Amino acid sequence: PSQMEHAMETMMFTFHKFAGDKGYLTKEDLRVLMEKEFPGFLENQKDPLAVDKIMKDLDQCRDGKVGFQSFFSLIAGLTIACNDYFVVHMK
Template sequence: MEAAIGVLVSQFKAYAGSDGSSDTLSRGEFQKLVASQLPNLVKDAGDPAVIDHLMSTLDENCDGELTFLEFWQLVGRLANQHGGFGK
């Protein structure tokens, strides 16, 4: 699990850092990350409406960017669905 956490953190920072700040994901960075890294777990990851909806549900402070903790909520939801938990 430690390796998986390391991968999640490094991927977040790699995508977040494309516009200068490695602390948050802009909408564009988030879309690139989801489309590239989660294409099988996020339906229609290339659809801007899907990305807008995800951003609005994850962006708790409504600043238009996602912190790692905000992004982590998506990881938890996807893991929950993928594992068949909460059905």
Template sequence: MGSPLSELETSMKSMMLVFHKYAGTDENQSKLTLSRNEAKQLLVKELSNFMKTPTDPKAMKDILDKMDIDGNQEMDFQEFIVMVSSITILCNDYLVHCLQKKGK
């Protein structure tokens, strides 16, 4: 048996599991992509603490439109990772801003 997963490996595994937890839950939907409905459910359930208005229909549409990089009305794993990375960068920027403000 291999060594335990590192924190980063555990985070990567979690992202894969979350994506596949929602992918293909809609009837007749590919198990390798998220439909807009599946992506919305993922955002509402998995990122509600990081999003100001996860239930605002216009804000949700804007987010889903931006996440669908190729415009095919589905989100593949690469688009999902870009979205998670973008949100993580914004959260880190906010954290750094707060730490710098606190240090002054």
């Protein structure tokens, strides 16, 4: 498998891991996910409303459910922010 394929699999298996048989994640799931997979970020975000605000944007329909694609939209936004930051300050 290539590195790209291992990476895509890790992101697929991640979401499933926190989503359960129910196939989606609640806000209770986003937080944990975010805690165990991005440790230096919510805690370093100073605010206590961290997760709620993430989810605001993830949940159009306010049904309290985050599915795969919206999950991907989270990762996309974090990855593109890091890339922006990398190209300017580090590349």
